[PDB]
Design an enzyme around this catalytic site. Sequence first.
Site, PDB file in Angstrom:
ATOM      1  N   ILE A  10       0.835  -1.185   0.000  1.00 50.26           N
ATOM      2  CA  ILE A  10       0.000   0.000   0.000  1.00 50.26           C
ATOM      3  C   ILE A  10       0.869   1.233   0.000  1.00 50.26           C
ATOM      4  O   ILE A  10       0.542   2.217  -0.629  1.00 50.26           O
ATOM      5  CB  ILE A  10      -0.917   0.013   1.259  1.00 50.26           C
ATOM      6  CG1 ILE A  10      -2.082  -0.920   1.064  1.00 50.26           C
ATOM      7  CG2 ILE A  10      -1.461   1.412   1.521  1.00 50.26           C
ATOM      8  CD1 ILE A  10      -2.899  -1.102   2.240  1.00 50.26           C
ATOM      9  N   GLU A  12       4.407   3.307   2.372  1.00 52.96           N
ATOM     10  CA  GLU A  12       5.287   3.394   3.521  1.00 52.96           C
ATOM     11  C   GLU A  12       4.646   4.272   4.560  1.00 52.96           C
ATOM     12  O   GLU A  12       4.381   5.445   4.349  1.00 52.96           O
ATOM     13  CB  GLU A  12       6.625   3.932   3.040  1.00 52.96           C
ATOM     14  CG  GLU A  12       6.839   3.417   1.638  1.00 52.96           C
ATOM     15  CD  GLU A  12       8.120   2.670   1.414  1.00 52.96           C
ATOM     16  OE1 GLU A  12       8.976   3.246   0.713  1.00 52.96           O
ATOM     17  OE2 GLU A  12       8.242   1.495   1.850  1.00 52.96           O
ATOM     18  N   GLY A  16       6.558   1.981   9.350  1.00 50.60           N
ATOM     19  CA  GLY A  16       6.968   0.814   8.600  1.00 50.60           C
ATOM     20  C   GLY A  16       6.120   0.616   7.398  1.00 50.60           C
ATOM     21  O   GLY A  16       5.199   1.414   7.138  1.00 50.60           O
ATOM     22  N   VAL A  17       6.452  -0.411   6.634  1.00 50.91           N
ATOM     23  CA  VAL A  17       5.731  -0.668   5.417  1.00 50.91           C
ATOM     24  C   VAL A  17       4.288  -1.082   5.757  1.00 50.91           C
ATOM     25  O   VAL A  17       3.974  -1.640   6.812  1.00 50.91           O
ATOM     26  CB  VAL A  17       6.434  -1.781   4.612  1.00 50.91           C
ATOM     27  CG1 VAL A  17       6.441  -3.070   5.303  1.00 50.91           C
ATOM     28  CG2 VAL A  17       5.889  -1.898   3.218  1.00 50.91           C
ATOM     29  N   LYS A  33       0.318  -3.375   9.058  1.00 52.57           N
ATOM     30  CA  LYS A  33       1.257  -2.295   9.311  1.00 52.57           C
ATOM     31  C   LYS A  33       2.383  -2.773  10.174  1.00 52.57           C
ATOM     32  O   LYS A  33       2.192  -3.065  11.329  1.00 52.57           O
ATOM     33  CB  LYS A  33       0.552  -1.127   9.946  1.00 52.57           C
ATOM     34  CG  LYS A  33      -0.607  -0.665   9.162  1.00 52.57           C
ATOM     35  CD  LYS A  33      -1.025   0.750   9.605  1.00 52.57           C
ATOM     36  CE  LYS A  33      -1.202   1.684   8.481  1.00 52.57           C
ATOM     37  NZ  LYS A  33      -2.019   2.884   8.810  1.00 52.57           N
ATOM     38  N   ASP A 120      -1.433  12.960  15.356  1.00 52.32           N
ATOM     39  CA  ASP A 120      -0.842  13.127  14.060  1.00 52.32           C
ATOM     40  C   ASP A 120      -1.900  12.959  12.986  1.00 52.32           C
ATOM     41  O   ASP A 120      -1.654  12.282  11.978  1.00 52.32           O
ATOM     42  CB  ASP A 120       0.332  12.164  13.807  1.00 52.32           C
ATOM     43  CG  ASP A 120       1.164  12.545  12.606  1.00 52.32           C
ATOM     44  OD1 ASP A 120       1.170  13.738  12.166  1.00 52.32           O
ATOM     45  OD2 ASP A 120       1.814  11.628  12.004  1.00 52.32           O
ATOM     46  N   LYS A 122      -3.898  13.777   9.735  1.00 46.10           N
ATOM     47  CA  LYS A 122      -3.493  14.321   8.423  1.00 46.10           C
ATOM     48  C   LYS A 122      -4.357  13.649   7.380  1.00 46.10           C
ATOM     49  O   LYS A 122      -4.890  12.569   7.637  1.00 46.10           O
ATOM     50  CB  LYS A 122      -2.014  14.125   8.123  1.00 46.10           C
ATOM     51  CG  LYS A 122      -1.593  12.728   8.137  1.00 46.10           C
ATOM     52  CD  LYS A 122      -0.091  12.644   8.232  1.00 46.10           C
ATOM     53  CE  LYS A 122       0.453  11.446   8.835  1.00 46.10           C
ATOM     54  NZ  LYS A 122       1.873  11.645   9.266  1.00 46.10           N
ATOM     55  N   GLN A 124      -3.797  11.812   4.906  1.00 45.83           N
ATOM     56  CA  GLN A 124      -3.395  10.447   4.626  1.00 45.83           C
ATOM     57  C   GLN A 124      -3.901   9.406   5.601  1.00 45.83           C
ATOM     58  O   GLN A 124      -3.933   8.239   5.278  1.00 45.83           O
ATOM     59  CB  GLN A 124      -1.886  10.383   4.467  1.00 45.83           C
ATOM     60  CG  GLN A 124      -1.321  10.755   3.132  1.00 45.83           C
ATOM     61  CD  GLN A 124       0.031  10.068   2.942  1.00 45.83           C
ATOM     62  OE1 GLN A 124       0.677   9.645   3.947  1.00 45.83           O
ATOM     63  NE2 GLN A 124       0.480   9.943   1.684  1.00 45.83           N
ATOM     64  N   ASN A 125      -4.194   9.821   6.821  1.00 44.12           N
ATOM     65  CA  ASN A 125      -4.760   8.856   7.771  1.00 44.12           C
ATOM     66  C   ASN A 125      -6.227   8.996   8.025  1.00 44.12           C
ATOM     67  O   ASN A 125      -6.778   8.476   8.987  1.00 44.12           O
ATOM     68  CB  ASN A 125      -3.924   8.686   8.992  1.00 44.12           C
ATOM     69  CG  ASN A 125      -3.682   9.873   9.769  1.00 44.12           C
ATOM     70  OD1 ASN A 125      -2.493  10.011  10.404  1.00 44.12           O
ATOM     71  ND2 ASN A 125      -4.608  10.787   9.786  1.00 44.12           N
TER      72      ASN A 125
HETATM   73  C1  LIG Z   1       0.300   6.124   4.062  1.00 44.56           C
HETATM   74  C2  LIG Z   1       0.107   4.638   3.837  1.00 44.56           C
HETATM   75  C3  LIG Z   1       1.430   3.920   3.659  1.00 44.56           C
HETATM   76  C4  LIG Z   1      -0.674   4.024   4.961  1.00 44.56           C
HETATM   77  O1  LIG Z   1      -0.382   4.158   6.172  1.00 44.56           O
HETATM   78  C5  LIG Z   1      -1.855   3.236   4.465  1.00 44.56           C
HETATM   79  O2  LIG Z   1      -2.752   2.933   5.498  1.00 44.56           O
HETATM   80  C6  LIG Z   1      -3.864   2.239   5.274  1.00 44.56           C
HETATM   81  N1  LIG Z   1      -4.327   2.035   4.058  1.00 44.56           N
HETATM   82  C7  LIG Z   1      -5.457   1.319   3.773  1.00 44.56           C
HETATM   83  N2  LIG Z   1      -5.844   1.127   2.505  1.00 44.56           N
HETATM   84  N3  LIG Z   1      -6.232   0.840   4.741  1.00 44.56           N
HETATM   85  C8  LIG Z   1      -5.829   1.031   6.018  1.00 44.56           C
HETATM   86  N4  LIG Z   1      -6.313   0.690   7.212  1.00 44.56           N
HETATM   87  C9  LIG Z   1      -5.546   1.139   8.196  1.00 44.56           C
HETATM   88  N5  LIG Z   1      -4.539   1.818   7.726  1.00 44.56           N
HETATM   89  C10 LIG Z   1      -4.667   1.782   6.386  1.00 44.56           C
END
Ligand SMILES: CC(C)C(=O)COc1nc(N)nc2nc[nH]c12
EC number: 2.7.11.22
Length: 291
Positions: A10, A12, A16-17, A33, A120, A122, A124-125
């Site tokens: 998905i 970084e 971690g990845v 994660k 944190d 943002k 992206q989360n």
């Molecule tokens: C920025 C990226 C690397 C990331 O942290 C991706 O995080 C996630 N992505 C998806 N599709 N489903 C999730 N459920 C929990 N976290 C999730």
Amino acid sequence: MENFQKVEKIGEGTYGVVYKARNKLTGEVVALKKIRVPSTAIREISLLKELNHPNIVKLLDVIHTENKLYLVFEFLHQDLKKFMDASALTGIPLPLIKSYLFQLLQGLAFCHSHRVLHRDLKPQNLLINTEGAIKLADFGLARAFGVPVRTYTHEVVTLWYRAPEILLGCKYYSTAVDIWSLGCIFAEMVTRRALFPGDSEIDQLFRIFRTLGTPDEVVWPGVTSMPDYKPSFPKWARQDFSKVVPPLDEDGRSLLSQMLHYDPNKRISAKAALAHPFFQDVTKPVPHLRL
Ligand SMILES: CC(C)C(=O)COc1nc(N)nc2nc[nH]c12
């Protein structure tokens, strides 16, 4: 880990990845994660397993194997950062912005009632689905693992959504920091541009100050005694929110202003925000998502 088949990287994450994966026995599709393990962190994470709410991405399990830690989360198909970039030509419709803000506030009110913060937040989360839901990912992980300057792959952890009390060196900041972040996100959804895109701690602070005015003892009693406050900060005047987030009506500007109060003790709470008149006409539209 042998119980999971990786489908695709998905990206970084902070720690971690992150992989899309499938459970081999139950068939469940999940986000895995990796957290690049102190007992205290295990106990904190363990507490997050019970902090369940429809607007909080569900922590399914914790796997600790050979000094390696993996968090298994509910998988969602899109994040708000990507959705905002995709919606850049026309903007996210106000009813959808409102719906998302309302939902995010419900997630915050829940976690904050348990004294858990995100710290944190943002785009992206903030994860979205086809049904019009939005959910907060990574809630509580900052207290468990810290928020680093750089991620595990050296990416700069963004400062754009960081509350002023954090930037000013307050050690014992509160749930108000999440309200600040969400207000910044609200503004970004409305304007289609980050509110405070700082590229250093001082640039972050000075961007805040240039829009909201340099804080002083009148608007923020005690501010001048904070660890990283400097009397030599330039003194900028506050801008009208009508200039800062234009499209936005007076109910929205009023709420945003309360989410962006300097004094954390005066900043609106998530529960009070839910009661604000901006949400009188809230609805739950469904987003256009092409997956
Ligand atoms: C920025 C990226 C690397 C990331 O942290 C991706 O995080 C996630 N992505 C998806 N599709 N489903 C999730 N459920 C929990 N976290 C999730």
